[PDB]
Automatic annotation (TrEMBL), chain C:
SUPFAM superfamilies: Acetyl-CoA synthetase-like (SSF56801). CDD domains: ACS. Its EC number is 6.2.1.1. Residues 540-622 form the AMP-binding enzyme C-terminal domain. One of its GO terms (biological process) is acetyl-CoA biosynthetic process from acetate. The keyword Transmembrane does not apply. It comes from Cryptococcus neoformans Tu259-1. Residues 48-94 form the Acetyl-coenzyme A synthetase N-terminal domain. This is Acetyl-coenzyme A synthetase.
Amino acid sequence: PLPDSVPESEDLFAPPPRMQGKEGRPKPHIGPNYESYVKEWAKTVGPNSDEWWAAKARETLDWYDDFKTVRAGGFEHGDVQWFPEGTLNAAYNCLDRHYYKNPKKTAIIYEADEPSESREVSYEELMQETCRVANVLKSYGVKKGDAVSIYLPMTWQAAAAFLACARIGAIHSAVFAGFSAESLRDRVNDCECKVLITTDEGRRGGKTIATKQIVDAALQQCPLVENVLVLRRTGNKVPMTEGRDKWWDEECAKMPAYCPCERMASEDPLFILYTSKPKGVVHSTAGYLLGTALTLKYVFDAHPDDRFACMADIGWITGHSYIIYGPLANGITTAVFESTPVYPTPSRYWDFVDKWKATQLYTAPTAIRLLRRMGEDHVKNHDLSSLRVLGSVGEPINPEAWHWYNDFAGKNQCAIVDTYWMTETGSISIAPLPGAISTKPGSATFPFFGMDVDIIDPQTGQVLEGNDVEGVLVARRPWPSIARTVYRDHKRYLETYMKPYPGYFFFGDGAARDYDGYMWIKGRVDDVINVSGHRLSTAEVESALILHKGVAETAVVGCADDLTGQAVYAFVTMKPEFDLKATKEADLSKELAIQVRKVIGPFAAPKKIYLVSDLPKTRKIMRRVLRKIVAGEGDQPQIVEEVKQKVT
Amino acid sequence: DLFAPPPRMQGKEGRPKPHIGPNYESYVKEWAKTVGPNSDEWWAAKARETLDWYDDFKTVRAGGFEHGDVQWFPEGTLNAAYNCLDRHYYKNPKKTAIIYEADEPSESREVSYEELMQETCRVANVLKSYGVKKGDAVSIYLPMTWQAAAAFLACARIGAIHSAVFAGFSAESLRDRVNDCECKVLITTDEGRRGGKTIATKQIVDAALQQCPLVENVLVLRRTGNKVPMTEGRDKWWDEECAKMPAYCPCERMASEDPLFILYTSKPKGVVHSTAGYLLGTALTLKYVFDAHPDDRFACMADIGWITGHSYIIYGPLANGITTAVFESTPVYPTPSRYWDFVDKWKATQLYTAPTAIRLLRRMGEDHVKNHDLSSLRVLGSVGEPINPEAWHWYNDFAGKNQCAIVDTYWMTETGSISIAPLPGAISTKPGSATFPFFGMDVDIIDPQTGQVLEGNDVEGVLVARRPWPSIARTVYRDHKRYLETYMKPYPGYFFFGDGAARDYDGYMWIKGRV
Amino acid sequence: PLPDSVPESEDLFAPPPRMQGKEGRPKPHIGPNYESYVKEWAKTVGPNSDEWWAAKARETLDWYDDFKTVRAGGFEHGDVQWFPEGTLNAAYNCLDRHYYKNPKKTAIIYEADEPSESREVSYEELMQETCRVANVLKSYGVKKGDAVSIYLPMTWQAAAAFLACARIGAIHSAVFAGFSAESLRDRVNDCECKVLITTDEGRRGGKTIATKQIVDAALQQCPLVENVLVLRRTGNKVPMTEGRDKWWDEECAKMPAYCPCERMASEDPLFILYTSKPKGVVHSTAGYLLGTALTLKYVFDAHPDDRFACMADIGWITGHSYIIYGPLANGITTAVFESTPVYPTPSRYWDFVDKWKATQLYTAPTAIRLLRRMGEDHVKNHDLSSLRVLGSVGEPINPEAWHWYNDFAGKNQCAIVDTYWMTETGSISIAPLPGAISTKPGSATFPFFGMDVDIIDPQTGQVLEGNDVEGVLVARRPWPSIARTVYRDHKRYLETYMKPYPGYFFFGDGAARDYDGYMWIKGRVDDVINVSGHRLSTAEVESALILHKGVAETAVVGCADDLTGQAVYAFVTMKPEFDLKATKEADLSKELAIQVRKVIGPFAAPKKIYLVSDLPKTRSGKIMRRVLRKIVAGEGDQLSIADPQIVEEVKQKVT
Ligand SMILES: Nc1ncnc2c1ncn2[C@@H]1O[C@H](COP(=O)(O)OC2CCCC2)[C@@H](O)[C@H]1O
Ligand SMILES: Nc1ncnc2c1ncn2[C@@H]1O[C@H](COP(=O)(O)OC2CCCC2)[C@@H](O)[C@H]1O
Ligand SMILES: Nc1ncnc2c1ncn2[C@@H]1O[C@H](COP(=O)(O)OC2CCCC2)[C@@H](O)[C@H]1O
Ligand SMILES: [Cl-]
Ligand SMILES: [Cl-]
Ligand SMILES: [Cl-]
């Protein structure tokens, strides 16, 4: 499905001199043209890819036991396997083997919230801190295969917390520091962890995150948790429960600074990551580790002495893959950025780049757009010439933001890599190789090694041949870092990703292939309602009403309201196998509204819930029609009258 | 009265050429390699060729009868589930692993290695989710449905010790075995079916569990879907539990001498077998005693609740990566032609049954067997008891149509694999005789009164073994003293089978039953 | 810091013919001179020592998985690592691999308390009993990483108890059989063990140790203990608690005689040993195992058919390293000695040596002092010629005891190895290599392979360069068998050993390095004093002072002298039934000197004769002659004591 050659220019930004091995920069791993990418990429998919993947696995990672089979399983039953017979350890490949080679080399550039508090953490320090925690965890009784929940802000010990679980064969489950008590509670209960690692307080952008207060509130509804390990990030007074709670530093003081590595099967679960019932995406060890290491080495052209600056949070897969696992497996310096893009000033990113001579920067378009609105003076006068690659992740990067990234952050001398992937992909799925691909602003370009993607017509289900087609993005074969299951919910795993288009992996995103073969991912434009000052998306309320099994389809719109600013109005149609006769229509309305209140909050409950035979549809739901009906525009295909009656 | 290997066992008529042949001299030449002073090289070669090891072994054998410290390949590590499922699935996932002959013939179907492995991994994941660890006993109470193999191999996959109880034992019999192994998880079925009759397995299980304080989880297979009593919390449905689990599960790396299973003989005597030696013994006996070849379809009509089902339904055949049969019905349901309807239906290449079944079908009449094809068969096996010459010829004349080799296989639960049997491509058979010992088996006749070994031929006495063999039972569960007393004390330096035996003038062994 | 060559003699005892490959004895592993020790020792420290240690690790031990890194970590944070990626099993290296090679070879010479009850235990028997116990422990639920407390006397099954824990990956915590219930309770609670292995009763020297009686008393305050496995050492009636207590023989009768080996990481903890708050010294598996195996092989010059007789107790690190792990790792015969040095007669050691033809003997100077007080008749007429190496461990050895060891046990044909080490060092740290190093009485000589020691001036904090310097002993680099932590108290570990002198390990003992470079722990001690050209032994001059009946004890020391080269200084204490009132103290000083002059000559009179209330002594009875030497030399400001006021009294009489 990929082009054999991408010609021409004038809308193509070719790899700049810094990515051509000129000006003393390293020669790129893949280059110099598109044909060089295809030549290698074809080796990683299709007929002889086993030889390629076996070689990369043995080169990239340190194994205790060699593997015999390269790959097995597939989408149909969710039995994906990569290098199944081999054994290894994530902590060994990210800490031990590098500490053995260069102990004093910096592993983490810890950019603290306050710039003066920033410092470098070496591989020796990170490993010793990781081993102390692992020894603490073993003393609590944590065994191989046990879940450990982590609720940590962007301080450097979070990597030690992750790697400690990976060291002993435990399954860490990171929860974004800043999640509510209810959100943390659901994830803690779902993974059935008995140990929680958290901090007393968080710090970000000069504001304090009351983590331990949130943890205490959440733990009241988490009966399984027995031990809490509390990092003294600020040292301020926080409530501590006797017996349950112990101090991280005090506990580590009793333990040795070395801890042996558990020999893990390639398919032993490495972690659970809940996407924002909670969906705990489960990743294996060897395939995920190889995927992060290879994507970092090629998508960002990382080289042995590089300093990689990913400004994401470890609560998202970006921090998992491209702050901790990817960079540390490659033995390079990685950045843990505790602050915000504009604290203390909108030059924070660029002070960081010149301070540490960062070679790659990896952030989200929301940060890029924020800095553009702050002004050129915060970026125009910096050096930034240590950078070679600038990365965008999380959402489409708009043409204005792409050029600002290129003109000021890169000074027209960096390659811009727009990366598309998901929590379930484990590593970057579609992204330009900076030394080979000429980029188009807003395009993720071409699939990574091991990714064989295609566009499927959502209506017919058939694969769209050729260019200038749009549909839904699918993958044809499993890749090493693919999620292996959803924790204790394999049925939801198969239904969500393997059932909708059989024989394929369903990303769930719209995509386009334009004319040169460049891939374009479509985003989401779900409407936003301002209820009493709170921004509610119509998707959340529609996703909340559908949890009532028996509801087939919903479409919520927003109308004006004299009391709340705006009100949520919801149209609901029940599934045929319901026979709604044991309940009056008003009983279901109260039931559904209470349901949304419990799951989104006391403000997202619909004002009126209209039960209708069917929603108005074309071939999507005509929400513009529904909005006008709620707003008294019936004066301005038969269901429309039915909807008018139920509203009037 | 000597039956030489027939044309189907000579490489004629398109059949595969036998592994050992064509004469007695060919059997002796290889057999001498497997016993005595320099046999370690042969066994080391066979162990490495037959099985997939995660870690190699250094020592071949150690220990002996005196203290029951038998060791084979002790430093090596491997997994029974890997050698029976994974390695074959990686080579040919669509190959039939189990021919599931249901009680109703129309409900029969083929289960691939892909399906058997996926189901095994799901159950293992359920067991791990229950907290089952390596070394834990798990009791299995299952009728002859194909998931019984998945249940067995799931325990072996995670290093648990499965303990099968024949579906049909009373609640007290199930209770005694469940309590003895101290298992906390029981795998059973809602109902079993055999011969048009329903086995109230879950009903029996509930009665037994009232006297089993240790059992915390019961995994209930929905074999029939009829309403059976289920205890909230304790009891869960097999399909619902597996629906939540992934279809792959990693293999626990097991020491060669890690226990593979407990099998209680009908105080309960729990015979314990290790992993590597048992696995190697069953695989070699199946390959040689039945002359199995890669595309063969092996039909052993035993029950998985007996050692015969353990060795020659599940472990032996699946280790060789061939097709094995799980026969849920009886020899005479729906008609006394069921065995022969089955053989032609699936083109079975070997049949393995008991003389009790042979005598049952012979008394039913020739009309049920004479008109079948049966020409896919090459070897007919008898096990469990001496086979009468009347029963032997009826087996040979109608089932084999005088074109199959008859293997009378003698062994015991404690031997793990076949001990004395003719090699079908080399040994000429005598009706009712087990002939000669298998590779690694060094047997002799001892004068029971004097305790001395009877030299020469045409002698009768008791059968003893001189050296341990790889698949020998290693102990009796938590009753090692009973193990030594029953087998190692009566004739010190020997293994005492407990059967009288005679060796004729030609050297053939004739088993005479118990002492 | 080490000498390149040790010259001369006359205070140097060169390796005797039994340690030269003469008289049919094996040629020593290191020899024949000091230069040969340095040539090998230099390979074990410094720049290229990883290659030497990697070779030794692979040659000495059987690994399930090979290691990649040789060493890492260090003193600063207590993250010491040796061969971290490798896997092995102590029970495999101590039992299985030797059993596979020679099953009938004697593993333990079990010398029972009654000599007639002694017998040989083969490797096959020891392994079978180890596997039976390990199987029992697994049935109790003991998992890899679980602590098991052991309270056992010196019966041979103690090795089976230890190695059973190592076989399944449990962490055994040995408690000296004879500790009170309170001492046993604290150790049992501190390691949080749930299984205790003990005996019904112990026997030593005709007296019975009421072990099960003590165990029951302690267990009343041990809520975590669920199972007690009781060895039937005597078969006498002992209280047994239903459920908790089971018989060792009965439990093993139900179990198989083989048990698979748990594949242990190099740095997996092998055992906890609490020193007499309790300090639980924790040792890893591979580094400890290699250290004990190498020290036994080289410090005692062990050979495949040797019979090693270490008379220690397994409740101490000496029993851990040089009864069980070291010798059994080398696959040789080891001795478990259940009796005392004087039961049934003070000739028990020498009856034992001739009975089993022991090739090395390893005991404590405290034991040597007991037998020396019993008389020469118990040793003069024995054979003892199967011995080649005589070892002393536990405390500084005075020259008088050293010569008695050398003259009678060795018949002046054995090398005496004075071994200095600690529970925290795991294996011998400083000791002569018997086939290469010439010995000085009372000196530990030179460091072992991998030990890089130095003397630091405590006042200045700087390391003392050169020879004839004394200060405190420190080690410069980690060694394989170093203890890795104090159980759940790593802060105490760093503070006790790594904080006092950063970058160094602080032994806590003073040491001196003489002009020849020999290390003297706790101080130099005098043997022969050269007064006006005559060689005087401290024994002769002390034997002369004791002829004055009324004198109870004397101890003469030597200092430099500008007129006689060296001067004899004598400390004398009179018998209680003397009533020293008819003579001024100066009158007795002249009288004693004239007596020594009359009996040894006009040159042997001591320069000063100090009358003191009592000589300084330790709780073991050792007269601290090293203290007395320092006091006479004006080092009372720098300087186990049973009476600390005796030292001050001595300082006053000298100053
Ligand atoms: N380059 C991109 N262009 C357009 N959309 C993108 C792009 N990258 C991601 N997305 C959307 O993010 C979802 C995945 O979110 P998540 O699983 O939370 O992972 C987070 C953390 C890392 C990836 C986002 C996709 O399914 C898409 O909807
Ligand atoms: N070919 C044979 N010829 C004569 N007797 C035989 C033969 N096979 C078995 N037996 C008797 O069955 C006992 C073993 O029974 P069991 O432990 O159930 O072993 C199982 C496995 C064999 C089938 C039952 C033997 O010891 C004998 O008594
Ligand atoms: N040869 C020796 N010369 C001088 N002093 C010595 C000597 N051996 C020991 N010590 C002192 O005993 C402590 C160690 O005792 P310990 O840890 O119980 O180990 C015991 C058990 C094995 C080692 C002794 C040292 O630190 C010293 O004070
Ligand atoms: Cl790199
Ligand atoms: Cl085959
Ligand atoms: Cl040796």
